[PDB]
Each structure stands twice: as structure tokens, then as C-alpha cells.
Amino acid sequence: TPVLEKNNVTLTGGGENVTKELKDKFTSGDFTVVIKYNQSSEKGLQALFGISNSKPGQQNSYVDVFLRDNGELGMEARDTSSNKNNLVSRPASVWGKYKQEAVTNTVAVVADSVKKTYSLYANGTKVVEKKVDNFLNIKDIKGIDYYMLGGVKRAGKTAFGFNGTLENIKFFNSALDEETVKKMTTNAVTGHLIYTANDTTGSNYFRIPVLYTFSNGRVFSSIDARYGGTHDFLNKINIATSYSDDNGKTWTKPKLTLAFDDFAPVPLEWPREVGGRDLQISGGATYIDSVIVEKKNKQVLMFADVMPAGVSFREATRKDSGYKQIDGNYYLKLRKQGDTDYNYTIRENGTVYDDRTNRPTEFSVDKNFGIKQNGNYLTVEQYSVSFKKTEYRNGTKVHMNIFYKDALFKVVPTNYIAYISSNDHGESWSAPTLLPPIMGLNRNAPYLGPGRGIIESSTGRILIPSYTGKESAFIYSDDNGASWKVKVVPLPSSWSAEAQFVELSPGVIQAYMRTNNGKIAYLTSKDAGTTWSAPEYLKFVSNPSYGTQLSIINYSQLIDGKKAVILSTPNSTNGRKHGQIWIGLINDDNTIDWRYHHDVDYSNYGYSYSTLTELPNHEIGLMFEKFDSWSRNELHMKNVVPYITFKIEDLKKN
């Protein structure tokens, strides 16, 4: 039951005094406050409410909950005379704007004297819960005499003045329980999640979204289910999928599509504090960075990077493919426990040969890289993680796999690429096929540029974007995917050259990519990817040197009477921020008129990896990482990868 409830309080930084209403309501000193609000202006630091000693000399004696112009939700609880100052927050907790309108968010705070915790909720998620040693509730702070909506009274002056409308605000004089407040903060923002923490995947975290629309009208998503926080490495990562048969309104519950089980797919509470957030799951085989394409025959492909357990993408050897050439064929090498050389190969039917004697052994490797001996599976114990992080054997047996820490036979500790095909628009998938040593025997595979591949219309060539760190690697097939080759293109510098393709006209394609110079590069081919021009750079996007992944797609419908492309990227030198969608119209000479752009949220809000698809109804689907995924400060955060949609008319505005 609320001790005070107020409605539709509209404010422009001046606040509203509710001292009369709230003084003498807080017996224990504990509290819960639930605020449904929208901001009319995001700028500066804004308190939703403030409880304070207003008297001169007592400006550090207050409790508040605040919003920043980057979408961070926090709270302070301070006492002046004891010099105790508590701050609890989480980045990227709220939404600012959406299609020109202030977004309604619902956030809450809980202060619990027993547990000595402050908890913050936003939009259905508990964004942070922190035990504090210098715990302060309202009674602990000396001489509280002022209770305020939309600010904090410090020394008789309004501070942190809120700009917007408090739609509903509820003050309770006790700590409400976790699930009550999760339900109270649930709203329309909550339904923009396709993948959620501890859903059917078992993962608390996700990164690297991909959207694709199939020819039958299904909209398909894939994503990294990253179990040990959001680290790229070392980590345990599965690729999950989920789809919509109604233009994105509703989505299937996620399935695991690419996954190993040396570790179980289970939720882990990954520490965000400075001294824990660098921790990693050491030793777990991984699929990472998905790429999707639909063939002309309606069969679907999906590619992914494959990392054996323990193998950091910077301790992975770079001068070994993992393959041997024997009598003109390529066979994946294996090392047996206790050997120093790689004496064995996987050949026909998965039969393991001793290369020295050139004879088949009793061992074989199945379609999923699992090891058998005389037709019976070898096993290893699966690992679990508990927290002070420990990794231990949990008593469950899973198949021994050549990608594992504890395998009798092991692949070269480097990165690989695998692909799976589906004949039923992603309801079921073939077993994984590892790509051949397309870069050469004495080089490791490239790394995929996440998003989609394309079928170039004039040749039917399939093109999959990848990179080496020094070169673009344009993986292609000229035989409807039966065989694979690569065009390697030296870049001007050490670009993490994540790319996506667009066709401009028949035979003519462009690869748009990330760079290490702050700009988006694009390379043009006028022979369907066989040869590539020197790079050019977009003049209107300006990012940090490290760069971010982008999304660009072809669009089926004319815009202003012209063939169009649609680009999504952050655009900011301050971080992975300021998401924009750009409409480019193709001219008769194949130059692009970049005529329209739309800012996804306010400029200082988080926007990292993103994916665009055209919906069957010709609206646009976007899923994106609504946080800064480079920042060491915005790691291991739950429920931060939403799906939103636009009409062309929406994307014309800004």
C-alpha cells in the first residue's frame, strides 16, 4: 500500500514540494519508490525525486534516484556530518526517445536496512542490487525536512531538476520484494526483447544480434548466447535462434542452434564490479559471430566462428589452418594426448587415420565432432562454474569432443569457421561442416563479419564477409554452396574489417566495413566480387578508431522513385553511441545519395552492434545492442538487446 501516490505531474526543472505529504510517513526508514515517467529533455543529471535536509550546510544529506543523458539509472544516499556517500547505478537502464516521442519508462528503487542493499529496477529488470557497508536509509540521514518530486533541495535551492512528466509515482515506507517490483516496472519497453536473461537458452547475456527475412515471409533472428558475461573471450558461447511468422509481432522462444556441452547452458551471475568483471570462463568451446544467408533454392545457411576450449582469439596460432593435404585432399589434423606432433587426420566417414603408418585406427569422429572408439562414444566430465570463481567437474558425462580441453584427440588450437544448412526455414538444421583451409594450409581461418551474406543476382555467387585483421576475406561459392573459395583483399591498415555487402546494380557490389581510422570504409566490385577497388570512406559517420560493426541491407521497394539501401551504425567519437539509420538512394551511375537519416535514441545513449532486416510488409526490423559493448564499464549487463521497427516514413525524420 502506497503512503503517497501522485499523477501526471509535468515539470521543467522547477520540481514540486510534497513535504507535507511525506514527512512522518517513514517509520522504519526503509523505502520503495516506483516512478513511471518520460523525459521531455534528456540533458544533464535529473532526479525523479529527492528526500533531503534542505538547510544551509546540509547539501550532502539526501536520498535520490537519477537519470543521466546516456540512459544510466542510479541512486544516491548521503549524510553530510558523517561524510557517508552511497552511489548505486547501472548504465543503459532506460530509453530516451522512440520515433519522435518521449519513451515511457518505469523505474524503481528499494532500500532494505536488514540486507543493507539498494536495488534499482528499470522496465521489468532488476538492473542492480548492491550491498553497502555505510548503508543509509531516510532515518539514518540527519535532519531530513524536505521531500520533493523532480529534484533535490540542497541549501534551499532545487538541484538535479527533472524535465518531463512523472506519469505515476508511488512511495512506500518499506522494502518491496524483488518480484513485486519487477512486475510493477513491466511496460511496453519490456516487450521489445526477443532474448531475455535466463530464458530457454539458459544464458544471462547476449551479444551480436542478426536478423534475416526468408522468402516464405518468416523473419529469423540469431544471436550470441554468452554465458560467462559478455566477454568475447574467454567465454562459453552458443548461437541461439528465434523467429517470427507475423512480421515480428511475436517471436518463438529461443532455441540453441550451435552449441557444445563441455559446459552446460546455465545462468551465471557475472560480477560487474571493477575487481570481478575481468574474470572469464577459462575453458569452454565456443561458437561466436553468426552470418545468415538464404540460397536461391530456399535452403538457408548459417556460418559461425568455432573456437576450441581455452583458445583465446589472441593465443590461437595464426600460421596453422588445422588441416593437412594428403593426395590432394584436405583433412583436419588431430593430436593425441602425450604426442607433440599432430600424427592423425580425420578422413572418409570420420575415420581417424594414423598418418605415420597411413592406416585407419579404431577411433572415429562423428558429424558433431564427438569422438568414438570402436563405434562407442568416449566421454568426459562436463564443467560447472560457481562463485571467488571456481571451475569444476560436475559428474555429468558428455561426449568427448575434439574441440574440448579434455579430449584424447585435439584440433590445432586455432579458430575455424563452420556452417549448417536448413531445408525448413530454420526449424531444423544439418550437422556443422567445418570450412576447408581456404586461406592456405599455413594460415588460420578468417573471422566472420556478423550479419548476413548475399547472393549476387547476375552470377548467383554466394558471398560471405570475413576478415583477418590485415585483409578482407570474401568467402564465396559459384556452385550453389557445394564448394568454397576466397578473395583476400589487403587493407590499408590493421582493420577489424567486419563487413556487409550491398548490390547496386547487376554485377556491381559494395562491401561496407569497420576500420581502425574512425571511418566506415566501402570497397566496390564491378565483377561480382572478383576484383575490388581501393577503399573510399563515408563522410558523414565519425567514430572512435577502434570502430564498431555495422549493418547495411538492400531494400526491395523504391524510395523517392529510386532503388535504396539502408544502413545502421553508431556515430560518435565519444563511444559506441548515437545510433543512426541512414537511407541511401542509388543513382544511375551507382553513386549513392545519402538522403535521409534517423537517430535511434538521444546522441549520448548506447548503440553498439546492430542488424537490419526488411519485413514482409516492407517495414524495417532492427535489433541492436543498446549499450556500449566496448566499454569496460558496460560489461555483463542483462536485457539490453531490443528489437524495434520502423516505417520508411519514420526513417525519413531527422
Ligand SMILES: CCC(CC)O[C@@H]1C=C(C(=O)O)C[C@H](N)[C@H]1NC(C)=O
Ligand atoms: C576480439 C577479436 C575481434 C577483432 C579482430 O574483435 C571482435 C570485436 C567485437 C567488438 O568490438 O565488440 C566483437 C566481435 N565478436 C569480436 N570478434 C571475435 C572473434 O572475438
